[PDB]
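> example.struct
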């Protein structure tokens, strides 16, 4: 069972800039013996050359990297992708380019917070998303040789909640916490540690995201965002409407308290500089850690400016000659604007996507922080601490309960306000602190999105594999 049959691969082609990309596809493959939702299937795409004993970009059937992208967003279900898919959500263009690059692609469907089983019961809440990702990885590795590509070169990719999925897969290789769930699903008898991690704006470290958000936006009392509404625009993308508001005095009080506590949290992480010096924040949110955030934004501006991009758009920067020499971070942030209210993730009334993510068999949603549980405005339960810890990529970096991928590439746009810049920065520094390879950046004027720099992503991948 769960044996991949190469006879399932059928010839296909997709046009890419007047150039035809030939490949083979094997679709809707069940990757566990006992699935609980229709979405639990995966698609396999292989450059045609690998069925001819030939090569592509230096790769061959036996050596080709296996890109495993997911379409998870908002911790909702993520259907198995396809290079010919055009319906939102999709990263079809990335698969097209990957195949052209010579990569094998296995796109697995992933359960989400809204997924229900055969009796109408919720079966997609935490930790379903990572369990499915692992099951798919195990299916791939179990089928080494049968499936084209090098199973020792699996590289996950994802955006937003999907970025957290990718990061978690890389950080929690062969963790025993997920064995019971994987066993129940009848997942393939193989490992799930991967080669590398690609993650765009990973929405992770949820239990500390509210504190990080306020450390960043406290003092900015108006918020602005677009909320999805009924109806869809081109290719299934939901329609959106602008919504804004002003923080109540109570929210402002909560904001200050959350920002204050971020100092304690950040300091106890014991993050360090290359020379071992401890990064910190004072009671007012100032300090060596704040300088790192400032410098990343300065570097972001410098990179864009160096390539001919005009950076006069946001406030706060100081330019001397051709160099960005300083930044009034508070000014930049006000210019950027606040997106979410307070708390930004663990809402007191349990109405956020994250609250729903932490619901379970009997609770539609739960709190995942002591603060929101204590100040809940509705009857509520606090999610299991062990579960919260288990889905936080960071938990595995300060311990030895898994096999962590050695290569990481993380991106978070400088215009992305879905979570504080501190969130991805913490992951990046912690990875460096524990000896793991990390390529990190805050791309100038890039919003909450991903897969916008394929040239660099693939160059990074080829660098690791060649």
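> example.seq
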């Amino acid at each position: 069972r769960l044996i991949f049959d190469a006879d399932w691969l059928v010839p296909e082609q997709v046009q890419v800039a007047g150039q035809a990309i030939q490949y083979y596809a094997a679709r809707n493959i069940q990757y566990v013996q006992h699935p609980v939702a229709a979405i639990q299937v995966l698609n396999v795409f292989v450059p045609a050359a690998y069925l001819h004993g030939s090569s592509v970009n230096g790769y061959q059937r036996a050596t080709a990297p296996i890109l495993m992208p997911n379409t998870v967003g908002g911790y909702l279900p993520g259907p198995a992708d396809d290079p010919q898919r055009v319906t939102w959500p999709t990263n079809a263009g990335t698969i097209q380019q990957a195949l052209k690059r010579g990569y094998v692609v296995v796109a697995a469907g992933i359960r989400g917070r809204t997924t229900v089983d055969k009796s109408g019961q919720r079966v997609g809440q935490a930790p379903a998303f990572i369990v499915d990702m692992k099951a798919a990885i195990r299916y791939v590795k179990y089928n080494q040789g049968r499936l084209p590509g090098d199973t020792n070169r699996i590289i996950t990719n994802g955006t937003s909640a999907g970025g957290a999925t990718s990061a978690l897969a890389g950080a929690s290789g062969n963790s025993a916490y997920f064995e019971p769930a994987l066993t129940a699903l009848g997942a393939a008898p193989a490992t799930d540690d991967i080669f590398a991690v690609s993650a765009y704006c990973p929405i992770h470290n949820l239990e500390h995201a509210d504190m990080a958000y306020e450390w960043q936006f406290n003092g900015i009392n108006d918020w602005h965002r677009y909320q999805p509404v009924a109806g869809t625009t081109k290719n299934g993308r939901p329609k959106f409407e602008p919504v804004s508001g002003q923080l109540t005095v109570e929210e402002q009080a909560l904001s200050l308290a959350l920002k204050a506590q971020f100092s304690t949290y950040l300091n106890q992480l014991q993050l360090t500089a290359s020379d071992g010096t401890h990064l910190t924040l004072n009671e007012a949110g100032m300090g060596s850690f704040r300088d790192v955030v400032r410098q990343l934004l300065i570097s972001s501006a410098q990179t864009a400016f160096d390539q001919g991009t005009d950076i006069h758009k946001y406030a706060g920067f100081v330019v001397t000659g051709n160099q960005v020499t300083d930044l009034d971070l508070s000014a930049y942030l006000k210019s950027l604007t606040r997106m979410k209210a307070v708390p930004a993730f663990d809402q007191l009334d349990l109405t956020s996507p994250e609250n729903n993510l932490f619901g379970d068999a009997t609770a539609k949603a739960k709190h995942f922080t002591a603060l929101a549980q204590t100040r809940s405005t509705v009857t509520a339960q606090l999610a299991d601490a062990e579960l919260i810890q288990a889905i936080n990529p960071l938990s595995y970096l300060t311990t030895t309960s898994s096999q962590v991928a050695k290569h990481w590439r993380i991106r978070h746009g400088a215009a992305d306000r879905d979570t504080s810049f501190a969130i991805p920065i913490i992951l990046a520094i912690m990875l460096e602190n524990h000896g793991y390879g990390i390529d990190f950046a805050l791309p100038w004027d890039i919003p909450h999105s991903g897969d916008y720099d394929l040239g660099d992503l693939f160059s990074w991948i080829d660098g690791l594999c060649q």
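> remarks
The radius of gyration is 22 Å.
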